[PDB]
Structure formats: structure tokens, C-alpha cells
Structure 1
Amino acid sequence: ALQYEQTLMYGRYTQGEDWIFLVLLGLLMALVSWVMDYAIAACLQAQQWMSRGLNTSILLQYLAWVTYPVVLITFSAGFTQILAPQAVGSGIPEMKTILRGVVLKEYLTLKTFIAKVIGLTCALGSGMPLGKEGPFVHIASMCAALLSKFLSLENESRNTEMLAAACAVGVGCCFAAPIGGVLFSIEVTSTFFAVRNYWRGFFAATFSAFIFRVLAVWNRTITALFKTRFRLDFPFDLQELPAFAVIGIASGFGGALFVYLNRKIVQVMRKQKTINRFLMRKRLLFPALVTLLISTLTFPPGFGQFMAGQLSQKETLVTLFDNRTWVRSTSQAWNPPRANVFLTLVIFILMKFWMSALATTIPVPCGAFMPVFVIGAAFGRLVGESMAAWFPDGIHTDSSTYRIVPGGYAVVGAAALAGAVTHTVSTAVIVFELTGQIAHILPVMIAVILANAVAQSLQPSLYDSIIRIKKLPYLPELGWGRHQQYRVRVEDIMVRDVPHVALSCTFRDLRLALHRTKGRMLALVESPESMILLGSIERSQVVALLGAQLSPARWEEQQLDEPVNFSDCKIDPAPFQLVERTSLHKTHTIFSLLGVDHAYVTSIGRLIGIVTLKELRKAIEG
């Protein structure tokens, strides 16, 4: 059991019925998502009304423009800190750790639910570049846990499956994409998923989508969030494929750079102890300063006109996916009177990159999927506009028909950058669900594959990076194509010094052994000379043996050093063990599936070594 400790940016962790349950989970998640969306829309509408009311002087417009988001972010951070400090940030890495066996202290309580809901609503009510997929996963998991609490009024296996279904429900409700949501949730929270549990997520997401449609028709887009209208007859040509490949490669490099920049930002001010202490005594100055800095640069009368600061995230995504060519309201916002579309796109890309990283490193419930999606869409739109300008009449034409469509480039770029950042290939399906069309399928697959290859060659995923930052249990993923590990054996990476005890030992031996292990379990051995393994023992239990046979109720303590009879103790008969010539592939696979953190190496029945997650991490990294 791990407990949250508060830090500046992220924190640290220190030491029959199925159908009804799925239907109820889907309905609850749909209702909660609808309520949150309504609240966020109301907040944005209030911001627009207040901004339109005060059109007198630039000073007052600036004051309102920088006062609304700062107040919203400060209130969100304060409310989250008062109720549940552990509800800060994305919830995908924490649930990935939970699904592997580890237990977090109070991660699935009602207070955390209230804090997460209110904080996400308040933080997303401002205009900061933040997402909601991780918070949605966490909220869905808490909803499933509370439903299990209610419906109760073997067990361990059931809970994990329900949480796995809840993650898919959360992703699907976040993107309004059942299939894409389930496939994305499978890739980011597990490595070996049972085929039997494949239908549960699809069923729950389908029920959620049906409830969404019913609510949409009872409340008055309906089909797709960001519906696009592209021609079905030759949307692209053959010679445009190199452009899509270039987009994919650049997106992979950019995703690696984004993950590296986020990690570097987090690390830098974990140093600088004086600034860190001064901010830790404030607890509300850092988010306020970040919000004030970001909002100032997006002021439309000032610097915000050169990066489309007047547009919101939904409006920014809608204009990039349109079926018009800007080069030859989308063009009005993306073509300021003093510049062209290219300069605006470049400035938008750079500023949004660094601002999105910095904003995702602040203490509020937030995600990082939509910002990178928008950045990738902008980069793809830039590439498409360049191609359209270079070929005004087409790339293969007789009567100048079938011109270049720059919106497919934006779709391809968004999917490629999202996949590169998250190390997933389901962003293709996600973007097909989001846009409502499947015409630009092959370029999307090509770009996603290339971006994933480059990103996995360069840097780890964002969620794995956050896991490393928070010091949670971390099993690095084996190289997809970077290297080979079919020749490395367990005899090399193991540690040849094993904390162990003997069957015929004395209490002095236990006293000497206990302090130097620094581990959870002790290995029972027949005899020191034979070194034959018989089982595993608990460190607390062998402490209790000394505490029980060496006690006031009987100095005398130094008189009693007889050999310890292990009959009273309880021994694990079959701990997890391996053999001498086991390959790294099998060890990694069993560690990944069983969710274990410790294995014994055995040679002809004798104890020769031990393997831990740390040794595996060094073996993979080196």
C-alpha cells in the first residue's frame, strides 16, 4: 500500500450481474459526462459574455481576459488541495499501476470523486491547453468502484475486470468513440488482455453512445464531434504519400521532444531548493503565475492575433478540418491583416507546444491529449497548405480537376502526433470516429506507424514518464525494433546475493539476516551448504518470531539462542521461480502478465540468484 505525498508539480508515492453492472456503469458515465460538458460550456459562455460586455478600453479587456482564467485555476487548485490532494493530474498511469496489483491508499473514494469532478470542471472552464482523457478514466473507475459498493448491498479477479471495463467506458465517453476508446484503453493500461473480456468494454461503450444520442435528441454535432466534409472520389493521389510519410516522421520526432520537454520541466524545479521551498510555502502562486503568463500572450489585441488567440480549442479544431483552401471563421482568424497563414501556423505550433507542456505540468486535474491533437492538426494543415500552394492546378490533372484537400493533411497530422506522444496506434480509429469519415485511411496508418517507430526509438511514452516521475512501479517495455534480447539469459541480469534463511539456523541468524535484506520476503533454505530452496517467508513474520520467542514474558533474551523450529511458522510452498537458462523474453513476458515484482533463480534445485524489476530495468535500458 502506497501513500501520496504532496509535491509542486506531480507528487510522489511512498511506502446475470455482469450485464446489469455494465449497463449501469455506462448510464452513469454518460450522465456525468453530459453534466460536465454542460458546465464547461456554461463557463465558456460566461467568459464570452463578460468579454463582450466590456468593450470600452484595452486596459479593461486585458484585466478581464487575465482575471477570469486566473481565478478559475486558483479556485480549482485550492479546492483540489483542500479535499483530495491525490486527484491532481492525469489518472491513466495510476490506474495502470492499480491494474497490475499495487494498491493506492485512497484513490477511489467519494472525496476524490468530488474533488476530481469539480476541479476538472473549473480548470477546463478556463482557456488553458488541457485535456480530459485521464481524468475521465479516473472518474469512470471511481464510478465503477462506487457501483460495486452499492450493488454488493474471486472478488479480486472481478474487481480488476470491472476496472478494465471502466477505463474503456471513460475513454469512449471522452472521445464519443466506442471502438477507438476501447482499443486506446487496452493499449495504455495493459500489455496482455484476455480475449474473453473483449466484449464487455464494447457493450458498455455502445450503451453509453446510445444514451448520448438519446440525450442529444432530447436536448438539441449529433453524429460526430468534429464532422468533416471531404469528397469521396479521389480525395488524395499517389504522389502525395511521401508528404504523409514526412508528416509521420516529423510527428514522431515532435512527440519525443514533447515528452522530453515535459520531463525536463518537471526535473528542473525539483532542484533549485530555495525557489522550490518558497513556492511550497505558497501553494497557489505557481499555478496563478503560469495562468497569468499564458493568458497574457494570447490576448487578441496584443500577441494573440498572430497565433489565433480569439479562437477556442473546439473552434480551433473545427477550422483546421474544413474543406477549404486558405492559400488559394477559419481564414479570418488564421489570416491576420499583418501576416499570412504560414507565419500564423508556425507561431501557433511553437507557442502551443511550449505552453501545453508547461500547463500540463501544473497541479490541476488535467490531461494532455487534445493539446497535442491540435498541434498535430496545425502542423498537418501547414504541410497541406504548402502542398496546395506548390501545385495550384493539381498534381495529376488533365482539366485541373481533383485539387489538393488540405484538411486530410490536418487529420493525418493530428493522428500521427497523438500516436507518437501516447505510443498508440488506435488514434487512427479515434480520428475516424471523431471526423465521421474513413476516406483518408492509408495515409493515417502510414503516418501513425512511422511516428510510433521514431518515438519508440527515441523516448518512452508520456504515461511511463509520469510513472517514473512519481516513483511508481515501472516495467520498461521491450524494444519493438530497436534491438534483440532473445540471447540474454536470466543468469546475467540476476543478483547473485540473495537474502535468505536456513532451516537449521538459530535466532541470532535471523537477527543478523533481517536488517540487511531491505526486502519484503526471505527465502527458506534446507541447509547453507546444500542451498536447496524450500519456500518463501514474510519479513514481518520472521520479525514476529523474534518478537514472540524473545519477549519479557519468560537477561533471558541473551540466554535464549536455540535453533529455531519453523513448524509454528507458515511457509509459502510454491513461490515464483525460474531456471538458469531462461531467456529475457520469457522473464519479461511473465513479469508483465503475472504483475509480479520478484522472482527466484534456481539451478538444479539450488538457490543461485534473484531477479527484481530494478535489474530488468537496467537490463532493458543498457
Structure 2
Amino acid sequence: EDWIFLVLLGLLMALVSWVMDYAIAACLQAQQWMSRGLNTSILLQYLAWVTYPVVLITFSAGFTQILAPQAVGSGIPEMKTILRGVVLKEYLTLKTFIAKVIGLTCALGSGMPLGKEGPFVHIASMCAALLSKFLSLFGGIYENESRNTEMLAAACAVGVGCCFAAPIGGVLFSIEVTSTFFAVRNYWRGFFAATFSAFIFRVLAVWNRDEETITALFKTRFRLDFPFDLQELPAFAVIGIASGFGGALFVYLNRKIVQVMRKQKTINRFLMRKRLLFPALVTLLISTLTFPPGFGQFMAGQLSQKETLVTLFDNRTWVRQGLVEELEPPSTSQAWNPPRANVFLTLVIFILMKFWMSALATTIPVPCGAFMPVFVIGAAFGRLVGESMAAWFPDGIHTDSSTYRIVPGGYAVVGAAALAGAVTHTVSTAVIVFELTGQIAHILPVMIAVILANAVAQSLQPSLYDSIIRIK
């Protein structure tokens, strides 16, 4: 009766994930349509572009504080505490489940630099607990606490699996973050349920008729002959160490932002009298800084996070598109080539802004995750490094008198994986990024970058989830 439990958990989690992503996509496309329809006057465009995300964030914060304040936060450190031995039976409730799902949907739909891995693992845990309660009516054997904890761990595995639609990588990431001593029985059960969840993904995508044909979400078409050369290994290692430092700095900045917000007595009081004003103000600041015909021309503000990542994972070299772009349509990568600034300038501005934007927006009293923003920052960093390597020498690396240009998409993949692993202190981001793209040709650079990033991060700073568990 355990296998049917896992199958039901996977099915329900798959349905919840798909409906949430449909709602988020609808919200973003509605935002884009509203922005495009009011192009007659710039002031009306600015007013819409500012008020919309502010409205969504304010509504999300308000609904969460009315219904269930405990749902606010990432959700991974709380489950680490739960699996540590502290039982918060009140913290997994149906009201909290509704609050979490609606708040996460509305927060991600506003275009804020937020993630979804923590909220998704929390929702998966809640769904497992609720389904266990629902099946408890038929038999009281289900109330044995140890097996409930085991099934909660399996639920964390399922949640991380359905978040990225990467089953094995998700299970490994959940193993890495939610536990310290882990039984192989739980690994088997979690990967069992993640298999069925990923199968429901595929069958639903086929029955859904989403795109032109049945294709991948993060299509990568890198050549398999020479994905990378041997001379690029020092560059990949440098990316790894830099991402480790960046992850440690990101955790440090997030912790000091929380410390400043808590410590300043006058600021804290002025906030707690008008607690809804803080999310509105931060959304105001960010959305003002991301106005497409304002400052968003320097930050690719017309693209959402998924579009930004897809554009960054392109196989074309942007620096050399000045010669081989006469028989090809204008790619979406044009957003990274503003008329007055080169690609390097917009890349460095995007990094230097989105870093603090994500760090500050993670602390907002809304259900949010921190994986996706850091992943995007790492991908952009890797893309910048790859474009710099292409610009240094455009003929490529000489080898056997055969030409092969540098592919900066692999650099972006390596940078994203390294920065995410550095922030989360995990090694499973290497397996996740292969199942995401679908190509494992860059296994050597990704692994080398991830180990170096984790080593440096362990040398400097604790994990973001450990930071949360310590400050909360």
C-alpha cells in the first residue's frame, strides 16, 4: 500500500505544479499584453508597469498574513527543522496549503526575481500530509510517526523533482538539503514517485497540445563533436571559484539585509505599523528600475525569467553575429544588444543589479524561493565569460588545423550550476542542469566548477538555508 501512496503523491503534485505554471504563464502574458496595448503614451505604460506588480505583491502579502502567516518564507529550512525532530503539526494545514499555493502563484506572476523550489517542496510536503490524513480514515496504521517522517522525506524528493521536472537531480537535491543521514529505502521510494510524476508531466504535455510539436522546455542544440576544448578548463575553473565567492557574498548580503531590517528600531516600528507597505515599496523600486523603455533597455526587462534563461542558453555567439546574420531571422537574443550599449555592458549591468535585486527581494514577506534568481545570475555570468573568451580570439583554439568556435552556452550552463551549488551548498545541481538542458556533453566543466564553488563556499559562508534556519 506504500506504492499506491507514492503514485497518488506524484500524481497530485504533478497536477498542482502544472496548474501553478499555467497560472503564472497566464499572468506574465497578460502583463505583456497590457504593456504592449498602452504604447500610445509612455506615462500610461509606466503607470501600468509599476502598479501591476505592486498590486500582485501587495495582494499576495495581504492574503498570506490574513490566512496563514507561517507559509511565508522559503520552506526548505522549516522542513529541515521538521525532519530534525521538531513536529509542527499546525504548520502543515489545508488553510496553510491554500495560502502557500495562492501566494506563490501571485508572487511569481508579478515578474519579481523570485524562485519556486522552496515553496514547491513545502507544498509537496503539505500535499503528502493531507493525503495521508485523507487515507487515515480507512486505517489507523498510517499514524506511525517514523513512517510519516519517511513519507515526508519522499514528498520533499517529489517536490524538488517536479519543480525542475528533473527527477533524479531533484531527488539528489532534496537528499542534499533536507537530510544529513539518509536511508536508501527513502531514496528508492522518492525516485519511484518522481518517475511517475515525470511520466504524468509527459502525458499531460502530450495531451495538452502546448507548442508546435513535442519538444523540450530548455532546448539546447550544442554540437557534440567538440563541446569544449582542454584550454578552456582554466576558464571553467575560474567561473567555478568566482561563483563560489558570489554565492557566499549573496548569502552574506541577504543575512545583513535581514539584520538591518530587524535591528533598526525606528525602521522596524515604521514597518510593523504598515507591514503591507514594505513589499509594495520594494516592488515599486524594482519595477521602476526594470521599465523596458526606461532602465529596462540595459537589463533585458522585456523578458521574464524563463525567457531570460532560454535566451541565455542560446548556442549562437552574439559577438560574432555581425558576419553570419544575413540569411537568418532576428533572434530573441536582440534584447541583450541595445542600440547604444554592447552586449558586455548590458551583461555587467544586469549582473550588478540583479544580484542585489534578488538578495533584497528574497526577504519580502511572501512565499518565494531563491534558486531561480541565482541560477539566472550564474547563467548570465557564464554567458559573459564565454562571450569574453570568444572576443579574446575569434578563430577559436587551434587543434589539428580544424576550426571550432567557442560555445558560450556551455559557459552559461557551467556558471549557473556553479553559482546555484555555491549558494545552496550542494553538488546535485550538476545532475539537475543535465536533465534540464538535455545534454550531458559538458559533464567535465560542470563538475569541476561545482566542486570548486562548493569548496570556496564552505571556506567562506554557510548555506542560504542554514542562514535562514539560524536567523529565523
Q: Distance in 1 between matches of 2:33 and 2:382?
A: 33
| Structure whose CA Rg is larger | 1
| Among candidates 351, 354, 357, match of residue 352 of structure 1 | 354
Shift of 1:224: 3.6
Q: How many residues align?
A: 453
Shift of 1:146: 0.7
| Among candidates 189, 193, 196, match of residue 207 of structure 1 | 196
Which segment drifts farther, 395-404 or 196-205?
A: 395-404
Which segment drifts farther, 178-187 or 153-162?
A: 153-162
Q: Deviation digits for residues 236-289 of structure 1, max 9, x if unmatched?
A: 111110000000000000000000000000001211111211110112100000
SS of equivalent residue, structure 2 residue 182: strand
Query: Does the CA contact (< 8 Å) of 1:394 and 1:400 recur in 2?
Result: no
Q: Deviation digits for residues 86-129 of structure 1, max 9, x if unmatched?
A: 01011100001001110225210000000001101111110100
Q: Distance in 2 between matches of 1:163 and 1:208?
A: 16
Q: Distance in 1 between matches of 2:85 and 2:264?
A: 35
SS of equivalent residue, structure 1 residue 197: helix
SS of equivalent residue, structure 2 residue 31: helix
Q: Deviation digits for residues 500-537 of structure 1, max 9, x if unmatched?
A: xxxxxxxxxxxxxxxxxxxxxxxxxxxxxxxxxxxxxx
Shift of 1:197: 2.2
Shift of 1:400: 5.1
| Among candidates 441, 454, 460, match of residue 439 of structure 1 | 441
Q: Distance in 1 between matches of 2:13 and 2:241?
A: 37
Q: Deviation digits for residues 561-617 of structure 1, max 9, x if unmatched?
A: xxxxxxxxxxxxxxxxxxxxxxxxxxxxxxxxxxxxxxxxxxxxxxxxxxxxxxxxx
Q: Which has the higher strand share?
A: 1
Which segment drifts farther, 40-49 or 157-166?
A: 40-49
Shift of 1:190: 0.6
Query: Does the CA contact (< 8 Å) of 1:213 and 1:222 recur in 2?
Result: no
Q: Distance in 2 between matches of 1:141 and 1:66?
A: 35
Q: Distance in 2 between matches of 1:226 and 1:186?
A: 24
Matched with 2:325 is: none
SS of equivalent residue, structure 1 residue 239: helix
SS of equivalent residue, structure 2 residue 286: helix
SS of equivalent residue, structure 1 residue 106: helix
Q: Distance in 1 between matches of 2:186 and 2:301?
A: 45
Shift of 1:331: 3.3
Which segment drifts farther, 416-425 or 387-396?
A: 387-396
Aligned 1:135-150 pairs, distance under 5 A: 135-150=119-134
Q: Distance in 1 between matches of 2:452 and 2:103?
A: 37
Shift of 1:196: 2.3
Q: Distance in 1 between matches of 2:459 and 2:216?
A: 34
Q: Deviation digits for residues 356-384 of structure 1, max 9, x if unmatched?
A: 00000100000000000000000000110
Q: Distance in 1 between matches of 2:172 and 2:407?
A: 29
Q: Distance in 2 between matches of 1:393 and 1:53?
A: 45
Matched with 2:135 is: 151
Q: Distance in 2 between matches of 1:104 and 1:141?
A: 12
| Among candidates 310, 314, 317, match of residue 322 of structure 1 | 314
Cα RMSD (Å) of the superposition?
Answer: 1.1
Shift of 1:152: 1.2
Q: Distance in 1 between matches of 2:39 and 2:216?
A: 35
Shift of 1:158: 0.7
Q: Distance in 2 between matches of 1:394 and 1:198?
A: 44
Q: Deviation digits for residues 303-362 of structure 1, max 9, x if unmatched?
A: 110111111111110111111000014431001011100011000001000000000010
Query: Does the CA contact (< 8 Å) of 1:419 and 1:427 recur in 2?
Result: yes
Aligned 1:535-614 pairs, distance under 5 A: none
Q: Does residue 1:366 correspond to 2:355, yes or no?
A: no
Query: Does the CA contact (< 8 Å) of 1:235 and 1:402 recur in 2?
Result: no
| Among candidates 62, 74, 79, match of residue 78 of structure 1 | 62
Q: Distance in 2 between matches of 1:148 and 1:195?
A: 22
Q: Distance in 1 between matches of 2:402 and 2:316?
A: 17
Shift of 1:397: 4.0
Q: Does residue 1:104 correspond to 2:88, yes or no?
A: yes
Q: Distance in 2 between matches of 1:197 and 1:285?
A: 43
Q: Distance in 1 between matches of 2:6 and 2:84?
A: 22
Structure 1 residues 313, 222: CA separation in 2 closer, same or farther (over 3 Å shift)? farther
Shift of 1:222: 4.9
Q: TM-score scaled by structure 1?
A: 0.72
| Structure 1 portions without partners, runs of 5+ | 1-16, 470-622
Which segment drifts farther, 300-309 or 397-406?
A: 397-406
Aligned 1:54-73 pairs, distance under 5 A: 54-73=38-57
Query: Does the CA contact (< 8 Å) of 1:26 and 1:205 recur in 2?
Result: yes
SS of equivalent residue, structure 1 residue 193: strand
Query: Does the CA contact (< 8 Å) of 1:425 and 1:448 recur in 2?
Result: yes
Q: Distance in 1 between matches of 2:407 and 2:389?
A: 9
Q: Distance in 1 between matches of 2:89 and 2:285?
A: 35
Query: Does the CA contact (< 8 Å) of 1:224 and 1:433 recur in 2?
Result: no
Q: Distance in 2 between matches of 1:225 and 1:108?
A: 32
Which segment drifts farther, 308-317 or 447-456?
A: 308-317
Q: Distance in 2 between matches of 1:269 and 1:423?
A: 25
Shift of 1:53: 1.1
Query: Does the CA contact (< 8 Å) of 1:223 and 1:436 recur in 2?
Result: no
Q: Deviation digits for residues 25-57 of structure 1, max 9, x if unmatched?
A: 000000111111111111111111111111111
Q: Distance in 1 between matches of 2:182 and 2:12?
A: 25
SS of equivalent residue, structure 1 residue 393: coil
Query: Does the CA contact (< 8 Å) of 1:381 and 1:409 recur in 2?
Result: yes
Q: Distance in 1 between matches of 2:225 and 2:364?
A: 46
Which segment drifts farther, 50-59 or 358-367?
A: 50-59
Q: Distance in 2 between matches of 1:232 and 1:465?
A: 40
Shift of 1:455: 0.3
Structure 1 residues 201, 131: CA separation in 2 closer, same or farther (over 3 Å shift)? same
Shift of 1:300: 1.3
Q: Does residue 1:456 correspond to 2:451, yes or no?
A: no
Q: Distance in 2 between matches of 1:363 and 1:121?
A: 14
Structure 1 residues 311, 74: CA separation in 2 closer, same or farther (over 3 Å shift)? same
| Among candidates 86, 111, 115, match of residue 99 of structure 2 | 115
Q: Distance in 2 between matches of 1:395 and 1:189?
A: 43
Q: Does residue 1:46 correspond to 2:38, yes or no?
A: no
Q: Distance in 1 between matches of 2:373 and 2:284?
A: 19
Q: Which has the higher helix share?
A: 2
Query: Does the CA contact (< 8 Å) of 1:137 and 1:167 recur in 2?
Result: yes
Structure 1 residues 366, 137: CA separation in 2 closer, same or farther (over 3 Å shift)? same
SS of equivalent residue, structure 2 residue 230: coil
Q: Distance in 1 between matches of 2:442 and 2:105?
A: 34
Q: Deviation digits for residues 149-206 of structure 1, max 9, x if unmatched?
A: 1111180111010000000000000000000000000000111101222210111000
Q: Distance in 2 between matches of 1:318 and 1:351?
A: 20
Matched with 1:473 is: none
Shift of 1:398: 5.3
Query: Does the CA contact (< 8 Å) of 1:247 and 1:380 recur in 2?
Result: yes
